[PDB]
């Protein structure tokens, strides 16, 4: 005795940028922010196949071929799993720069999967879309990051406890916790940010790090601020990668002098994030980081928000 | 308009065994149990100096010389810090075996420091006794373990977020969480358990581990059981040390088949602990571990308790 149906034959979804690693939690912590993000539009087609109609905000850098593109691969797999024969056209709009360290590929992929699922009448739980977004990323870029993908899809702050099997845990965070993201207008390759990591690390360095990861998780779950500040030390990854990011040391120091809880590389960079406990503090942190990059003549965009609990959004 | 004074010129304190490492949290997680533990008796003396009168349960293995013994060093330092000239005799009773992986040296040291502080009228906060217990351990055994000492002194379950500076965090744990400890009657050296650890580990192994440490901390703070089970995997330390512990693999398997949440080496071994969610489960886990060591003709003692929130205790 209820009927709902949608007459829409198209849908537009927005999916948010995410900050991965979050200082000491390399490969295991990530959270979503409000901006920026990507948009995906899907229309139903009587003509078969998943096809890419158009890509914008791209500089023609992304694969137009459907079997090479992350979004089309994801959607194709979803349709195959459910045994649906349905034509789909995709228009993709990048509202964020690629290789920025902000989970760009993830946002597109999550946008597509979320989109297809809602458009075809919510046949799967949002929870269960994660693997498709993962396989999509894996098949396209040879490499999937759950600490980008999970918070992007689920919203909020996430611990990726294991990759195999995929074990993801959403954590509460204090409501007055703000993230300032600065994205410099320069491109550090993801490739060089991977290669530069050590293959081996000292046990005592690892212990120092997993102490901190525990300190950070406890600090968030318990709404304690002072513990988070002290726990946001990264002794392994940031010292290796920071050489790739122009002005990193000055920018970090400027954020800490402006009163940040802590500050590190976002994902694989060159973006940098800082945490603070109010929107006055977050803004002046953003202003001081901007002033760091300006002093070396590098253009920059600043974003300020609390953790985005929504995740993707129909627009 | 209040007077309290104690006429006692002696005091006896008991301090509990602790379980360090707790699976994946090598050097950073530890918790206290009810039994076993050590006892320290202190008397005031008109004759000067801190002196050891007697040691029991020892096999004469412990240093009788006051400048070589962990308990007397600790107490001497405490007295010096506060600028007190007071003679003290110490009688020490080991109610637990040495090098058992149960924080034996820690218990003695914590017992002494707690004792002296209460006996001389509580001049310091319990909180502030930790460094003295640390310096004591360091000067005597050349090596101090906060993940034994802190939970011993403070009670409960502890995260040691950093050693320098010393950053300790007490965490809540579910009230129905039980620990079964089995101590085999065989001695694995602490020396060989240190030397056998890798000096270097792969980054991907470290990541796997700090994911787990986060998974465990979140699991305890959130009273989730299933997450703790999955988070208690140690891919670095236990595989290296378990060769030193006779029957380890069979004993672990027997605990897991009896329904343990998880099971690993306690501190540096040869003791083994398992976690479960009821006192029926903890007991049958204990029985199955005992049966593992009996089958290789090694004597064993089993202890079962919830996490000891009290810490030291005047007796």
Short mmCIF file of C-alpha atoms in Angstrom, two decimals, chain A:
data_model
loop_
_atom_site.label_atom_id
_atom_site.label_comp_id
_atom_site.label_asym_id
_atom_site.label_seq_id
_atom_site.Cartn_x
_atom_site.Cartn_y
_atom_site.Cartn_z
CA UNK A 1 0.00 0.00 0.00
CA UNK A 2 2.89 2.38 -0.81
CA UNK A 3 4.05 3.36 -4.27
CA UNK A 4 6.99 5.57 -4.88
CA UNK A 5 8.62 5.93 -8.25
CA UNK A 6 11.00 8.40 -9.82
CA UNK A 7 10.33 9.72 -13.33
CA UNK A 8 13.90 11.03 -13.51
CA UNK A 9 16.02 9.37 -16.24
CA UNK A 10 19.17 11.14 -15.15
CA UNK A 11 20.93 11.97 -11.91
CA UNK A 12 23.76 14.21 -10.79
CA UNK A 13 25.90 13.32 -7.77
CA UNK A 14 28.61 15.24 -6.01
CA UNK A 15 31.31 13.41 -4.04
CA UNK A 16 33.73 15.12 -1.66
CA UNK A 17 37.49 15.50 -1.46
CA UNK A 18 39.02 13.42 1.34
CA UNK A 19 42.11 13.80 3.47
CA UNK A 20 44.05 10.52 3.78
CA UNK A 21 46.87 9.52 6.19
CA UNK A 22 45.93 12.26 8.66
CA UNK A 23 49.51 12.54 9.98
CA UNK A 24 50.56 9.34 11.73
CA UNK A 25 47.86 7.07 10.28
CA UNK A 26 49.49 6.38 6.92
CA UNK A 27 47.17 4.20 4.74
CA UNK A 28 44.70 3.72 7.60
CA UNK A 29 42.97 7.05 8.53
CA UNK A 30 40.99 9.35 6.26
CA UNK A 31 38.14 11.83 6.47
CA UNK A 32 35.87 13.73 4.08
CA UNK A 33 35.67 17.47 3.74
CA UNK A 34 32.96 19.75 2.31
CA UNK A 35 35.00 21.04 -0.68
CA UNK A 36 36.18 20.53 -3.18
CA UNK A 37 34.85 17.38 -4.91
CA UNK A 38 33.72 15.95 -8.22
CA UNK A 39 30.36 15.75 -9.99
CA UNK A 40 29.00 12.88 -12.07
CA UNK A 41 25.89 13.04 -14.24
CA UNK A 42 24.39 9.78 -15.55
CA UNK A 43 21.60 9.44 -18.12
CA UNK A 44 19.76 6.32 -19.17
CA UNK A 45 20.33 5.30 -22.79
CA UNK A 46 18.44 2.97 -25.13
CA UNK A 47 21.78 2.43 -26.88
CA UNK A 48 23.86 -0.25 -25.09
CA UNK A 49 27.02 0.02 -23.03
CA UNK A 50 28.44 2.38 -20.49
CA UNK A 51 29.88 5.34 -22.43
CA UNK A 52 31.63 8.54 -21.54
CA UNK A 53 29.94 11.47 -23.20
CA UNK A 54 32.07 14.25 -21.82
CA UNK A 55 34.77 15.24 -19.31
CA UNK A 56 35.27 18.80 -18.03
CA UNK A 57 37.82 20.41 -15.67
CA UNK A 58 40.30 17.88 -16.87
CA UNK A 59 42.75 19.44 -19.35
CA UNK A 60 41.93 16.37 -21.49
CA UNK A 61 44.15 14.40 -19.10
CA UNK A 62 41.62 11.64 -18.25
CA UNK A 63 40.88 8.49 -20.35
CA UNK A 64 37.85 8.99 -22.63
CA UNK A 65 37.74 5.20 -23.30
CA UNK A 66 35.14 3.46 -21.08
CA UNK A 67 37.30 0.40 -20.31
CA UNK A 68 40.18 2.66 -19.24
CA UNK A 69 38.20 5.14 -17.09
CA UNK A 70 37.65 4.63 -13.40
CA UNK A 71 34.00 5.78 -13.35
CA UNK A 72 32.82 3.71 -16.32
CA UNK A 73 34.68 0.58 -15.09
CA UNK A 74 32.97 0.88 -11.70
CA UNK A 75 29.49 1.37 -13.14
CA UNK A 76 29.97 -1.41 -15.69
CA UNK A 77 30.94 -3.82 -12.88
CA UNK A 78 27.98 -2.79 -10.81
CA UNK A 79 25.59 -3.44 -13.71
CA UNK A 80 27.27 -6.78 -14.41
CA UNK A 81 27.06 -7.96 -10.79
CA UNK A 82 23.29 -7.31 -10.69
CA UNK A 83 22.85 -8.70 -14.21
CA UNK A 84 21.37 -5.48 -15.64
CA UNK A 85 21.43 -4.63 -19.33
CA UNK A 86 21.14 -0.86 -19.34
CA UNK A 87 22.81 1.83 -21.46
CA UNK A 88 24.42 4.65 -19.48
CA UNK A 89 26.00 7.92 -20.59
CA UNK A 90 28.36 9.63 -18.19
CA UNK A 91 29.24 13.31 -18.08
CA UNK A 92 32.05 13.90 -15.58
CA UNK A 93 32.89 17.29 -14.08
CA UNK A 94 36.14 17.74 -12.18
CA UNK A 95 35.63 20.47 -9.61
CA UNK A 96 39.04 19.70 -8.13
CA UNK A 97 42.56 19.26 -9.51
CA UNK A 98 44.07 15.84 -10.29
CA UNK A 99 46.99 14.43 -8.23
CA UNK A 100 46.35 17.10 -5.64
CA UNK A 101 46.50 14.72 -2.67
CA UNK A 102 42.76 15.22 -2.13
CA UNK A 103 41.37 11.88 -3.33
CA UNK A 104 40.48 13.06 -6.83
CA UNK A 105 40.16 9.71 -8.53
CA UNK A 106 38.22 8.37 -5.53
CA UNK A 107 35.64 11.18 -5.65
CA UNK A 108 34.85 10.54 -9.31
CA UNK A 109 34.52 6.82 -8.74
CA UNK A 110 32.36 7.18 -5.62
CA UNK A 111 30.21 9.72 -7.47
CA UNK A 112 29.60 7.25 -10.33
CA UNK A 113 28.74 4.28 -8.11
CA UNK A 114 26.51 6.24 -5.79
CA UNK A 115 24.84 7.74 -8.87
CA UNK A 116 24.10 4.46 -10.66
CA UNK A 117 22.75 2.90 -7.50
CA UNK A 118 20.31 5.65 -6.75
CA UNK A 119 19.27 6.13 -10.39
CA UNK A 120 18.33 2.45 -10.80
CA UNK A 121 16.22 2.46 -7.63
CA UNK A 122 18.62 1.72 -4.73
CA UNK A 123 19.07 -2.00 -5.35
CA UNK A 124 22.07 -2.12 -3.02
CA UNK A 125 22.88 -0.67 0.36
CA UNK A 126 25.32 2.26 0.31
CA UNK A 127 27.55 0.17 2.58
CA UNK A 128 27.87 -2.43 -0.19
CA UNK A 129 28.98 -0.02 -2.90
CA UNK A 130 32.50 0.19 -1.49
CA UNK A 131 33.95 -2.91 -3.27
CA UNK A 132 32.78 -1.65 -6.67
CA UNK A 133 34.43 1.69 -6.07
CA UNK A 134 37.58 -0.22 -4.97
CA UNK A 135 37.65 -2.56 -8.05
CA UNK A 136 37.06 0.48 -10.28
CA UNK A 137 40.07 2.32 -8.83
CA UNK A 138 42.20 -0.83 -8.92
CA UNK A 139 41.49 -1.72 -12.57
CA UNK A 140 42.01 1.90 -13.76
CA UNK A 141 44.95 3.31 -11.76
CA UNK A 142 46.31 -0.14 -10.67
CA UNK A 143 45.96 0.97 -7.05
CA UNK A 144 43.00 1.57 -4.67
CA UNK A 145 42.99 3.63 -1.46
CA UNK A 146 40.29 2.75 1.05
CA UNK A 147 41.28 5.64 3.27
CA UNK A 148 40.17 7.89 0.42
CA UNK A 149 37.29 5.82 -0.97
CA UNK A 150 35.53 4.77 2.28
CA UNK A 151 35.23 8.28 3.85
CA UNK A 152 34.29 9.64 0.46
CA UNK A 153 31.43 7.17 0.10
CA UNK A 154 30.40 6.93 3.74
CA UNK A 155 31.17 10.41 4.94
CA UNK A 156 32.90 11.19 8.19
CA UNK A 157 36.11 9.95 9.70
CA UNK A 158 37.26 6.41 8.97
CA UNK A 159 39.80 3.84 10.19
CA UNK A 160 40.81 1.21 7.64
CA UNK A 161 41.78 -1.56 9.96
CA UNK A 162 42.70 -4.06 7.20
CA UNK A 163 42.71 -4.15 3.32
CA UNK A 164 42.37 -7.92 3.03
CA UNK A 165 39.80 -8.55 4.15
CA UNK A 166 38.47 -4.99 3.84
CA UNK A 167 37.73 -3.86 7.37
CA UNK A 168 36.46 -0.30 7.76
CA UNK A 169 35.33 1.46 10.92
CA UNK A 170 33.63 4.84 11.11
CA UNK A 171 34.72 6.90 14.13
CA UNK A 172 33.06 9.84 15.91
CA UNK A 173 35.00 13.10 15.94
CA UNK A 174 34.52 16.29 17.95
CA UNK A 175 31.96 18.59 16.34
CA UNK A 176 34.15 21.67 16.69
CA UNK A 177 37.08 20.08 14.88
CA UNK A 178 38.03 21.97 11.71
CA UNK A 179 40.26 21.09 8.82
CA UNK A 180 42.05 23.73 6.77
CA UNK A 181 43.20 22.39 3.39
CA UNK A 182 45.67 24.29 1.22
CA UNK A 183 46.30 23.16 -2.31
CA UNK A 184 49.40 24.70 -4.00
CA UNK A 185 49.29 25.25 -7.78
CA UNK A 186 52.15 22.91 -8.56
CA UNK A 187 52.19 19.22 -9.30
CA UNK A 188 54.05 16.60 -7.39
CA UNK A 189 53.60 13.18 -9.02
CA UNK A 190 51.85 10.37 -7.03
CA UNK A 191 54.46 8.10 -8.65
CA UNK A 192 57.43 9.93 -7.00
CA UNK A 193 55.57 10.21 -3.68
CA UNK A 194 55.30 6.35 -3.61
CA UNK A 195 58.83 5.53 -4.74
CA UNK A 196 60.37 7.82 -2.21
CA UNK A 197 58.93 5.96 0.83
CA UNK A 198 61.40 3.66 2.65
CA UNK A 199 60.96 -0.06 1.98
CA UNK A 200 62.22 -0.94 5.46
CA UNK A 201 61.86 1.01 8.70
CA UNK A 202 63.41 0.56 12.15
CA UNK A 203 61.23 -1.28 14.72
CA UNK A 204 61.59 1.58 17.23
CA UNK A 205 60.37 4.02 14.56
CA UNK A 206 57.37 1.80 13.86
CA UNK A 207 56.59 1.59 17.62
CA UNK A 208 56.77 5.36 17.91
CA UNK A 209 54.27 5.55 15.04
CA UNK A 210 51.74 3.01 16.27
CA UNK A 211 51.75 4.60 19.70
CA UNK A 212 50.72 7.80 17.88
CA UNK A 213 48.02 6.14 15.80
CA UNK A 214 46.54 4.81 19.03
CA UNK A 215 46.91 8.24 20.63
CA UNK A 216 45.05 9.81 17.71
CA UNK A 217 42.18 7.29 17.61
CA UNK A 218 41.70 7.60 21.40
CA UNK A 219 41.93 11.41 21.12
CA UNK A 220 39.10 11.47 18.56
CA UNK A 221 36.84 8.94 20.22
CA UNK A 222 37.15 10.82 23.52
CA UNK A 223 36.85 14.34 22.21
CA UNK A 224 40.23 15.21 23.72
CA UNK A 225 42.12 18.00 21.90
CA UNK A 226 45.48 18.09 23.64
CA UNK A 227 46.09 14.36 22.93
CA UNK A 228 45.37 14.80 19.20
CA UNK A 229 47.92 17.64 19.06
CA UNK A 230 50.60 15.43 20.56
CA UNK A 231 49.58 12.37 18.53
CA UNK A 232 49.88 14.10 15.17
CA UNK A 233 53.57 13.39 14.68
CA UNK A 234 54.65 11.45 11.63
CA UNK A 235 58.20 10.21 11.82
CA UNK A 236 58.25 7.99 8.73
CA UNK A 237 56.28 9.24 5.73
CA UNK A 238 56.20 13.04 5.99
CA UNK A 239 60.01 13.38 6.48
CA UNK A 240 60.45 11.25 3.31
CA UNK A 241 57.81 13.05 1.17
CA UNK A 242 58.17 16.60 2.36
CA UNK A 243 61.26 17.12 0.14
CA UNK A 244 58.87 16.82 -2.83
CA UNK A 245 56.62 19.64 -1.64
CA UNK A 246 57.86 23.17 -2.20
CA UNK A 247 57.82 25.27 0.98
CA UNK A 248 56.49 22.45 3.09
CA UNK A 249 58.56 23.24 6.15
CA UNK A 250 57.64 26.94 6.14
CA UNK A 251 53.99 26.22 5.50
CA UNK A 252 53.84 23.70 8.36
CA UNK A 253 55.57 26.07 10.73
CA UNK A 254 53.21 28.85 9.75
CA UNK A 255 50.19 26.63 10.49
CA UNK A 256 51.61 25.60 13.86
CA UNK A 257 52.47 29.23 14.75
CA UNK A 258 48.89 30.19 13.84
CA UNK A 259 47.73 27.68 16.49
CA UNK A 260 46.98 24.49 14.55
CA UNK A 261 46.54 21.29 16.56
CA UNK A 262 48.73 19.66 14.00
CA UNK A 263 49.52 19.81 10.35
CA UNK A 264 50.69 17.37 7.69
CA UNK A 265 50.59 16.25 4.06
CA UNK A 266 47.15 15.39 2.75
CA UNK A 267 47.24 11.94 1.14
CA UNK A 268 50.27 11.89 -1.14
CA UNK A 269 50.42 15.70 -1.54
CA UNK A 270 51.19 18.39 -2.51
CA UNK A 271 48.10 19.48 -0.49
CA UNK A 272 48.56 20.13 3.20
CA UNK A 273 45.96 20.10 5.97
CA UNK A 274 45.81 21.47 9.47
CA UNK A 275 43.41 20.69 12.28
CA UNK A 276 42.06 23.24 14.72
CA UNK A 277 39.14 23.66 17.13
CA UNK A 278 37.20 26.66 15.72
CA UNK A 279 36.31 28.34 12.43
CA UNK A 280 38.26 31.63 13.66
CA UNK A 281 41.36 29.41 14.12
CA UNK A 282 40.89 27.46 10.90
CA UNK A 283 40.63 30.67 8.90
CA UNK A 284 43.74 32.29 10.29
CA UNK A 285 45.64 29.02 9.81
CA UNK A 286 44.53 29.11 6.16
CA UNK A 287 45.71 32.70 5.84
CA UNK A 288 49.15 31.86 7.25
CA UNK A 289 49.63 28.83 4.98
CA UNK A 290 48.56 30.93 1.96
CA UNK A 291 51.14 33.51 3.00
CA UNK A 292 53.81 30.74 3.07
CA UNK A 293 53.15 29.72 -0.53
CA UNK A 294 52.76 33.30 -1.75
CA UNK A 295 56.21 34.08 -0.35
CA UNK A 296 57.65 31.56 -2.82
CA UNK A 297 55.34 32.68 -5.63
CA UNK A 298 53.16 29.58 -5.72
CA UNK A 299 49.39 30.01 -6.22
CA UNK A 300 47.14 28.33 -3.67
CA UNK A 301 43.50 27.52 -2.82
CA UNK A 302 42.32 27.25 0.77
CA UNK A 303 39.27 25.34 2.01
CA UNK A 304 37.92 25.32 5.55
CA UNK A 305 35.31 22.99 6.97
CA UNK A 306 34.32 20.58 9.70
CA UNK A 307 34.41 16.84 8.80
CA UNK A 308 31.75 16.16 6.18
CA UNK A 309 29.41 13.54 7.69
CA UNK A 310 27.21 13.29 4.59
CA UNK A 311 29.58 11.88 2.00
CA UNK A 312 28.03 11.91 -1.48
CA UNK A 313 25.04 14.09 -2.27
CA UNK A 314 22.46 14.21 -5.11
CA UNK A 315 22.51 17.70 -6.68
#
